Amino acid sequence: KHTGYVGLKNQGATCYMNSLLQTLFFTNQLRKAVYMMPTEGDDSSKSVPLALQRVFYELQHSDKPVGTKKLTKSFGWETLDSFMQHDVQELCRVLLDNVENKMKGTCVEGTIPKLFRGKMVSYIQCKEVDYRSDRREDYYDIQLSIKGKKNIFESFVDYVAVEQLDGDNKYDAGEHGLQEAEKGVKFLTLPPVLHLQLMRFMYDPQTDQNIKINDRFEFPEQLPLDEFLQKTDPKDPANYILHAVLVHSGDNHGGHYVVYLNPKGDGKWCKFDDDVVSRCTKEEAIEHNYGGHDDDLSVRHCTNAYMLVYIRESKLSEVLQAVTDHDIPQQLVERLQEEKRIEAQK
Numbered sequence: 001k002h003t004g005y006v007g008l009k010n011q012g013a014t015c016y017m018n019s020l021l022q023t024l025f026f027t028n029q030l031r032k033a034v035y036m037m038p039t040e041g042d043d044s045s046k047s048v049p050l051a052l053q054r055v056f057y058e059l060q061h062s063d064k065p066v067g068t069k070k071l072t073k074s075f076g077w078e079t080l081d082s083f084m085q086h087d088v089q090e091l092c093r094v095l096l097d098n099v100e101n102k103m104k105g106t107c108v109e110g111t112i113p114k115l116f117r118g119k120m121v122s123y124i125q126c127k128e129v130d131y132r133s134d135r136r137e138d139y140y141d142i143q144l145s146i147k148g149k150k151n152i153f154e155s156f157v158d159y160v161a162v163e164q165l166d167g168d169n170k171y172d173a174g175e176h177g178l179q180e181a182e183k184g185v186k187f188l189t190l191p192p193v194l195h196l197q198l199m200r201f202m203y204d205p206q207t208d209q210n211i212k213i214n215d216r217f218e219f220p221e222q223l224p225l226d227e228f229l230q231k232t233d234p235k236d237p238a239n240y241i242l243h244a245v246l247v248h249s250g251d252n253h254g255g256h257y258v259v260y261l262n263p264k265g266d267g268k269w270c271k272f273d274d275d276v277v278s279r280c281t282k283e284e285a286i287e288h289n290y291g292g293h294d295d296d297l298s299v300r301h302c303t304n305a306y307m308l309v310y311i312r313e314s315k316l317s318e319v320l321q322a323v324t325d326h327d328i329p330q331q332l333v334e335r336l337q338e339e340k341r342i343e344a345q346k
């Protein structure tokens, strides 16, 4: 072990799960809050919050690959294809909704929206009459379209592009009944931790329906997003630093899953491939995951990003604050050592 980090066992077709688990483990401000969940009275076999605490504790302390069977048992994804029937966004939503729920009424309540919540304005503007509706919309990740988009800038541009409402899809303007309108979204705020879902898996019907888009899609190490804000802050530009690149090798149906991280936000990347963690180049983490072409029409080649984590540069120091063995409550420590004391009588 030259990296100082430990891997996660392969225990079935859990797909994106181990990549997610590493990505959240290294969201240090999240990890510390997770350690603070009051799990002492939890049922050791039904608690997703406890199982997540246990995986984090072992990731932080173990020298051997960390198992997850208690985790998959706790949120009930235990059949042969349970993870194949979902995606990384539903897993993460479920996990983090579970931990935030366990945080209610505690000092660490509101951690999840603090780290992940951003605000948009969704607006509908009538063309031939004077009505505009402006509403705030909260989001916790961003799904970016990648088909026909060459880079992340083009994806964000498409995301805030104006949609027309006319003909068979006209707008209910109430008192001025049906009106031709323009529908759009602008960003008000962007969160400290920015999860970008790259929409390579696109459910193309009807009705086969499984597909995966392997086209080239570039993303940068430094992502400036000020130009997509309704209003910019001179003291806090929306500059984001790439933290994690979650990678899939293959096409639809079958594939291999890896995550690249620079856990400290310092540009020193590692590759996390289940139980194997090793240092890699910045080029392996970034440019080599853009996807590409070798043969004609397709090959494919075939190892590209489907999710990215960026951290706001001004928030990097806080999100990635150090975690020590002293940040783990003794109640949790003793419970896990007792568990490891029950598992070692085999």
Ligand SMILES: CCc1c(-c2ccc(C(=O)NC)nc2)cnc(N)c1-c1ccc(O)cc1
Pocket (backbone or CB within 6 Å): 088, 089, 090, 092, 093, 096, 097, 098, 100, 101, 112, 113, 116, 140, 141, 195
């Ligand atoms: C923060 C998780 C989340 C929530 C969400 C928001 C709030 C709460 C909550 O406060 N629950 C009590 N739970 C889940 C809602 N939609 C989402 N797409 C996500 C999400 C975020 C990052 C990802 O990579 C994938 C999914």
